[PDB]
Design a protein around this ligand. Structure first.
Ligand SMILES: Cc1c(C(=O)C2=C(O)CCCC2=O)ccc2c1c(=O)n(CC(=O)Oc1ccc3ccc4cccc5ccc1c3c45)c(=O)n2C
Ligand SMILES: Cc1c(C(=O)C2=C(O)CCCC2=O)ccc2c1c(=O)n(CC(=O)Oc1ccc3ccc4cccc5ccc1c3c45)c(=O)n2C
Ligand SMILES: [Co+2]
Ligand SMILES: [Co+2]
Lengths: 383, 383
């Protein structure tokens, strides 16, 4: 059931902001690896003496990469006179974030009807404020509250092109790469304690529990009214045999933070062909593929949704498949995006739940823990 | 004249080490942009709990990219028990370097006959010590002295594959990229005061002045006995009309540091074709090309070294050409490698001075300041 308890009007995921040491190199690597085009910039060339910020887009997916310049360039500025295009940015906060966590997501941004109202309502309902609502060029309002760890939930609302102060990117520097990724499907946090994290976020958003769940973790998913904003949260399970990967995350990340971004593709076969061609020439690596037994077991599980040829294409690309009582999920996971075994990416595509497609169709792949373990056991048994 | 005054036996440039926020993303970007293969690693997967270091190679050119992990991973270690493969590494030094300067070169490494002797002689002759000689696996010795700013000159000597503790890279992650780059030709520093910088470095190395030189800078070049290790140093010229780019460097870098790396190609035409194909898909951008008048003027200057077709190929690729009384230089410059207008790369190839080719054949392109200015003036005149 969906109680539709959102305490303010939420639209969709708007962007994800990475805090970086060098935004240029991370943005260029991600552009080539994921097939995202350079779409906007705010940096020295646009008069920003504070931070370098580069926007990549693929369809509706927006990835922002931000790094601080020397504070000496802006030493005479005050907030009323800032040349920063993102008024919540702070040199010390950014350097401290990156020193503590390494490369990772600082902001999960959702578009709302009124960022000032969303901020006020959130804080009235327990949200810890991070940056107050600030109106940019009387046209866009931005506000930030703490989500978990040093990750913020950023509210953005538009009166009527990314943010004022950003410039569209020179067409010769904007190569029209596109591997089929179209939007952010969900964004997942790792925390030490799931219960208090859920109570806090659901407390100030009104987001309701969408789903939930003996291998490493406990998880639950918070969702907006139309279930298009999806925020799963994990905690570690202590007392196992293999060490919890959630605990490994928390250790290497120095605490809670964003674990993975799941990116919807309109053609997951094409996306994975293109990404895998580039893994060893600057792109992203993928997790080891499941054994042949996993794909033999796919016939009995999804033989009514996917043809034998489509299942063979999943096998060639290492794609995992899970299913709901309503829809089917195709998914695959990258290796970590940077030096630390912390943040990674998931590529997904969902089949079913046609009404437009309902959010979360097919679930999040929890059934693939069991199915993977079973297939590994069968493959070693084949010996 | 060459006094051959080296105070210890120097062989050749060995490697350049970048200090990074995230080594993975910088290394992957550079690999694709420059056509360098992933050759060795030292990181969590090799038991290094301290730093992540990735080695790229192209021919004899070695680029090392290093970033710190959370200090919590190695908190129980002491130097006698370190898991770091580069014993001079320090978390605080690396974070402070990167916070101050952004992405850039920490170490210019030269191979010497005996790194302990080179270190002792250097310090006896005025070098400021940075890291004492440390023997790794009774097989390689490494030592470091201050060069300028926070850049060190690193001595490496081998008893008889990069460094002990590094592992050769998995062949599936080692794509054999190669755009023709073969070695480091020279490495250039920017300092506030050229005179004291020259006196200091020549003081402790015995390197002699190779060359020297009204547009922005004063420069001089220090060279080893066989003039294969070449270290130009620049200072700003104050009082001009256009602001000194050396002064802009010092401002955005927070002081002295490495300005550019000049990479010799065995086929500069192929290297630039390959690099330019990749500029807008994750690689490196190049400076704006000279006007058509520059290439018309090339005929009268190097028409005896380069055919008309070869000059047209230089024009298609934006390559600059200068000449000595002994040799000819083909060169081109990238835009800055990262967020700040600080470090950039030069691709070069030298013609002449055949004996093997003598080091520095054709000079460093100082004649192209005048020639560029003249050609820009002629092109606007063509109007
Ligand atoms: C991340 C994820 C989801 C997911 O999206 C998700 C949510 O959206 C919300 C609900 C909670 C949740 O989970 C769903 C299914 C997944 C995965 C996933 O990440 N992965 C791969 C893996 O576990 O990665 C790793 C990582 C580190 C390892 C270290 C050591 C290992 C030693 C042996 C075997 C391993 C297998 C996988 C391993 C590792 C090991 C999977 O298989 N499924 C099937
Ligand atoms: C870097 C370099 C060398 C070189 O290797 C070298 C050494 O090895 C040792 C000896 C000293 C030395 O110098 C030789 C020749 C060069 C260059 C070189 O860097 N460049 C390009 C440029 O000046 O870059 C820039 C950078 C920033 C600018 C900001 C604003 C500008 C406004 C107008 C015009 C510009 C032109 C160039 C500009 C800029 C402007 C060149 O043309 N030659 C011809
Ligand atoms: Co997921
Ligand atoms: Co040069």
């Amino acid at each position: 059931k969906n109680p539709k308890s959102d305490k303010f009007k939420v639209k969709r995921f708007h962007h994800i902001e990475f805090w970086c040491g060098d935004a240029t190199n991370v943005a260029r690597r991600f552009s080539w690896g994921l097939g995202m085009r350079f779409s906007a910039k705010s940096d020295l060339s646009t008069g920003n003496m504070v931070h370098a910020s580069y926007l990549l887009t693929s369809g509706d997916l927006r990835f922002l990469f931000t790094a601080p310049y020397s504070p000496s360039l802006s030493a005479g500025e005050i907030k009323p006179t800032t040349t920063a295009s993102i008024p919540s940015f702070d040199h010390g906060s950014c350097r401290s974030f990156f020193s503590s966590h390494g490369l990772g997501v600082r902001a999960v941004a959702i578009e709302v009807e009124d960022a000032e109202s969303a901020f006020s309502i959130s804080v009235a309902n327990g949200a810890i404020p991070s940056s107050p609502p600030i109106v940019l060029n009387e046209a866009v309002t931005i506000a930030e509250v703490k989500l978990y760890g040093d990750v913020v939930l950023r509210y953005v609302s538009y009166k009527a092109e990314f943010l004022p102060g950003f410039e569209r990117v020179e067409d010769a520097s904007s190569f029209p790469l596109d591997y089929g990724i179209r939007r952010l499907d969900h964004a997942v946090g790792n925390v030490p304690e799931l219960g208090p994290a859920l109570t806090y976020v659901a407390g100030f958003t009104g987001f309701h529990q969408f789903a939930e769940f003996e291998s490493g973790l406990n998880s639950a998913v918070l969702a907006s009214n139309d279930e298009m904003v999806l925020l799963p949260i994990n905690e570690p399970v202590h007392g196992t045999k293999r060490k919890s990967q959630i605990q490994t995350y928390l250790e290497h990340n120095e605490g809670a933070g964003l674990q993975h971004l799941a990116l919807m593709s309109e053609d997951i076969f094409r996306t994975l062909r293109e990404m895998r061609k580039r893994s060893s020439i600057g792109g992203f690596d993928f997790m080891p593929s499941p054994p042949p037994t996993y794909y033999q077991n796919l016939k009995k599980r999804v033989g009514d949704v996917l043809s034998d040829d489509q299942i063979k294409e999943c096998e060639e690309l290492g794609i995992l498949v899970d299913r709901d009582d309503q829809g089917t999920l195709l998914q695959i996971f990258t290796k970590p995006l940077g030096d630390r075994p912390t943040i990674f990416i998931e590529i997904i595509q969902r089949v079913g739940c046609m009404m437009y497609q309902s959010g979360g169709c097919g679930g999040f792949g929890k059934g693939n823990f069991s199915e993977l373990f079973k297939s590994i056991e069968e493959y070693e048994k084949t010996l």
